[PDB]
Amino acid sequence: AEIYNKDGNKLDLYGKVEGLHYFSDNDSKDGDKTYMRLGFKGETQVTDQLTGYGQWEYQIQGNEPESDNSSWTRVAFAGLKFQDVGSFDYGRNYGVVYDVTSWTDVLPEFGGDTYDSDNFMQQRGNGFATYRNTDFFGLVDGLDFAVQYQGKNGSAHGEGMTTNGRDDVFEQNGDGVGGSITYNYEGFGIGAAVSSSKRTWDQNNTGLIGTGDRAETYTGGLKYDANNIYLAAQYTQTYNATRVGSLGWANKAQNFEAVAQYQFDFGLRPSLAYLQSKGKNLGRGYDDEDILKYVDVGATYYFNKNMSTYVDYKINLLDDNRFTRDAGINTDDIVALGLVYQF
Amino acid sequence: AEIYNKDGNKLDLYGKVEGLHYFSDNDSKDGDKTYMRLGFKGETQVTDQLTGYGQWEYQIQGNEPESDNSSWTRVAFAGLKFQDVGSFDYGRNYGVVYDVTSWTDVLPEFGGDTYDSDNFMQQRGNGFATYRNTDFFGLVDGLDFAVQYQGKNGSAHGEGMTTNGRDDVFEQNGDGVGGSITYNYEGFGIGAAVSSSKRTWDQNNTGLIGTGDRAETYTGGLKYDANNIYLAAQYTQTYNATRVGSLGWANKAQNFEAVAQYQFDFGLRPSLAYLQSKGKNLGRGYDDEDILKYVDVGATYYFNKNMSTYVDYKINLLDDNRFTRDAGINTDDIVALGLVYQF
Amino acid sequence: AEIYNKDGNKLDLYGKVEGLHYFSDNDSKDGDKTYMRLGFKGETQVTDQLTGYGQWEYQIQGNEPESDNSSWTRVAFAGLKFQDVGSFDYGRNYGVVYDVTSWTDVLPEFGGDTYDSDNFMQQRGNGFATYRNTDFFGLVDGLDFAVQYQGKNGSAHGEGMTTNGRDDVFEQNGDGVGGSITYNYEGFGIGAAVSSSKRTWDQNNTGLIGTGDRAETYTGGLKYDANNIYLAAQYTQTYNATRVGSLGWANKAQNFEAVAQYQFDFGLRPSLAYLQSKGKNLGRGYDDEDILKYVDVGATYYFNKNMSTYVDYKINLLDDNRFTRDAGINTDDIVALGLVYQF
Ligand SMILES: CCCCCCCCOCCOCCOCCOCCO
Ligand SMILES: CCCCCCCC[S@@](=O)CCO
Ligand SMILES: CCCCCCCCCCCC
Ligand SMILES: CCCCCCCCCCCC
Ligand SMILES: CCCCCCCCCCCC
Ligand SMILES: CCCCCCCC
Ligand SMILES: CCCCCCCC
Ligand SMILES: CCCCCCCC
Ligand SMILES: CCCCCCCC
Ligand SMILES: CCCCCCC
Ligand SMILES: CCCCCCC
Ligand SMILES: CCCCCC
Ligand SMILES: CCCCCC
């Protein structure tokens, strides 16, 4: 909600509380998942063509006891935007790959999980320098593109250390570069994204699968978004980039997500989705295995802009086998039930 | 403070800073206790009869160094309210027992401590589904009641695991059910509450006192709140529910709290209170012991709605003996001195 | 930004996002330093002469992954202010020494580091009771002074325990007292501050250098702040007060900071600074050593009140030798590059 608009600056303080419960035969996925999100979005007019901006968003778990409660920053970035020239921002932000994979990340609770946070340039991550150009310098309506650099986020100790080092190898990265292009016309959308990040020494030298010099991704995507209908599909091919449970990464992974949704005038929005991550030549005697495979059925009822409720049903199609047990991957179904206040 | 009210939604961002110091011969109770509280309370009109709402409240300690600062979510819930029918909300919230025990929880700093947070359905806790009906379907002014279910919050590992598991056994619970009834007329209040929670395996199998299948509470309460006078008393009988320091819980505990307060026109509000928790047949050679016993004398001076100062004097009547030392219970007096800004 | 002003209370919710990157040959100083700051400042009119107030400020790192994100309270205090009589506030706040040392703490990113947080009464710390008088009871325009007491913040365990105890010996303190006087006339400023804190048992008995009964500081300072020119210098002499890396404190330290800045009408503000901390008779075979010594060159460009960008270049003049390696002191240069949105 816009709580300030005055003398060239405006500020939106926004947030939600999601009363959320998971039901599953997998006990680690069963029970209270209530949480809160909170952020600010600030925009200042410097000149008629130049705006300055910043955004910060935080998540705070509401399902924990008071002696041990966890929270985290999702995004935190500052930038400048010049008219018909583009924008630049730096901070914690979304990897440019997400400019396309985001098109299928629209389910009530599940979805968006053929990749992770702090997973190279695929989703949220630290130290993104992002240039964006919208409508191609004002010349081609609907043609957007982005160039992005992500600086090394290394270990907390020793060789490969950065000031913001983290010991979880799955959250590290070397220097990376990526780009995205998207074209939208009359509700139809086509898009493509590529990224290439150097892998750190720790990532290649702690005995995990899916090692090599570089983590790489190539994504194609399509969407239709008009007349109350939302259709979208993304295909992504990754190398040393896609996490395979606790085992490491996939030497090669083939990822696919498709979604269909409809919005009835009275407020109900049914949803049907399919997601799949296919691991190829994984190593360690595993060969080809599904990392992820599920169908998703759900519905959100929107009372108005500030209040909604939903059910999301993940029909988990993975078989319980050696690989999924070793990897620690959930092969059970989950139902999510939520009641959501936002401002 | 209401910082947004527009197009069917309103938002109260509220908070306080309590400059607070404790004085005690017990060194673990002596010194700086400064802290901050912050929250939001949001209400949306869906139709003329249906409102949606959410609330989040957070505490942030202000008495710690910057290298190691602790905070936590007190409440975080979403709900719906239909006129003359009732409300439902789910999240982290107050156990229905507190609908009555809260009547004596009005001291400047102390009080409210014959029970804990994350202590079955007695106070704040995770995963409360709460139905409430006010004025009995609009038929009986002042007659309110509540039915509440609390879902299992189990261990972080192994048998009895939940997705939000916690290893501190004192913060776990099984499935629980409770109810409350309250009648208020012309400043007089009568009320009752019952709860019954299943105990977890961990809680019954780590060698603590006060084990059994279920944690149970029965509470009766009375209050007078008018003509600048506040009188209140609550009696609660608990089984396997009341924490006894580090030792476990009380097989049976008899808890009593009484409070008298007066508000002078010029701003001073003196306070006198008595609290007692009597443990019965505790086990481990202890038999009957006082878990808590103190008299409380204090005064709050209210400069206005946003600024106040207070002294609270806990006259601790527990004797230093084997039980209190073993349990780690404070038997010393504490004086609290506070200066409080709120919005 | 002022987001509430109503019926005698006002509230400023303020904050910034600093997209920040460090470049250094020292890997522990190299990489993403993005962070967010957020606070509130609240003022209530009680009477025409008496205001109540509170302030809370929090920092949240934005350079960390989502599994492990760190934050902390910088200030958190409540107070009262009576006209021509002075103010009193209690909480976590700034030590009165900072009333003068702050005059050189104006660099874009570096500076302000001949002392620390939670470092006796030199900067931010817990449990400050501060009295302040501005314009000497309304009689001498520009004459301000402060008397401050800081209560013991002791260990988490055993002898010397406080309720807010901390095991990091560098963050502990005994009871302390301090004062400050400042005179400002027509852009010229002269000032002095003294503090004296008792040292804790832990601080004197864990085998560190720079032990003794008391940590003491004496500070003199000068500034010129007009006609777009900012000049400032502070000299501080400390005993058992100034931290020497991991080794302990300096038996005596001589600290000096000087700063020159200019603000061009079009927005650029160049900055040149010099900082030095000279350790005397340190013990452990070290004798006299520089604890800190660097020249600082930088520039901030202010797009407007809400948006700015800067480069800060710390030319580190310390030599890599036995002392700096043993102490763990950075002897390398750092360049900081920042883009800053604030409200
Ligand atoms: C192997 C081909 C290399 C391609 C050249 C590009 C270099 C790779 O990306 C560098 C990542 O580091 C960028 C760090 O960002 C610092 C920006 O700070 C912005 C603050 O406003
Ligand atoms: C705020 C104006 C300065 C930033 C513009 C830089 C990016 C524009 S364009 O080059 C995007 C493609 O890289
Ligand atoms: C309905 C009557 C209100 C309850 C009466 C008890 C008041 C407490 C007095 C004891 C003071 C410590
Ligand atoms: C509410 C008016 C005074 C009530 C005092 C009753 C005695 C309570 C103690 C019994 C616990 C076993
Ligand atoms: C000798 C100095 C010790 C300081 C004691 C601090 C007490 C201040 C408490 C006031 C709280 C509002
Ligand atoms: C050095 C900053 C400009 C980099 C060019 C952006 C397009 C790749
Ligand atoms: C926008 C530039 C990205 C380059 C990707 C490199 C593929 C090996
Ligand atoms: C040692 C005496 C405590 C200080 C009281 C402060 C209240 C103004
Ligand atoms: C190796 C750090 C030196 C960079 C200084 C650049 C000055 C703008
Ligand atoms: C045990 C299942 C309870 C579900 C109630 C709300 C769906
Ligand atoms: C910009 C001034 C540099 C002084 C360097 C001293 C070695
Ligand atoms: C519960 C009765 C306690 C008495 C001990 C002296
Ligand atoms: C400025 C020096 C003070 C003297 C006390 C040791």
Residue numbers in the entry:
A (entry chain D), B (entry chain E), C (entry chain F): 1 to 343
Copied sentences from the primary study:
Porins, which are beta-barrel proteins that traverse the bacterial outer membrane, facilitate the uptake of small polar nutrients and are the main entry pathway for many antibiotics. The crystal structures of OmpF and OmpC show that they are both built of 16 amphipathic β-strands arranged into a barrel with a central pore. L3 folds into the channel and narrows the pore at about the half way point, forming a “constriction zone” or “eyelet” that governs the effective pore size. At the eyelet, there is a strong transverse electric field due to the presence of conserved basic amino acid residues on the barrel wall facing acidic residues on L3.
The subsequent isolates retain this sequence but have also acquired further changes: at D18E (OmpC26), D18E S271F (OmpC28) and D18E, S271F, R124H (OmpC33). In OmpC26 (D18E), the longer side chain of glutamic acid protrudes into the lumen making a new salt bond to K16. A water molecule bound to the carboxyl group of 18E makes a new hydrogen bond network with E109 and Y310. The presence of this mutation slightly narrows the radius of the pore on the periplasmic side (below but not at the constriction zone) (3.28 Å to 2.95 Å). This creates in OmpC26 an elongated constriction zone along the axis normal to the membrane. The mutation D18E perturbs the hydrogen bonding arrangement at the pore with its precise effect varying between subunits. In two subunits the mutation slightly weakens the hydrogen bond (salt contact) with K16 (60% vs 21% of simulation time where contact is preserved) and creates a new contact with R37 instead. In the other subunit the D18E K16 contact is stabilized (69% vs 41%), as seen in the OmpC26 and OmpC28 crystal structures. Interestingly the change in sensitivity to cefotaxime (OmpC20 to OmpC26) correlates with the introduction of this antibiotic into the regime prior to the isolation of strain 4 (the isolate in which OmpC26 was first detected). Direct measurement of cell survival shows that a porin-deficient strain of E. coli transformed with OmpC26, OmpC28 or OmpC33 is, in each case, less sensitive to cefotaxime than the same strain transformed with OmpC20.
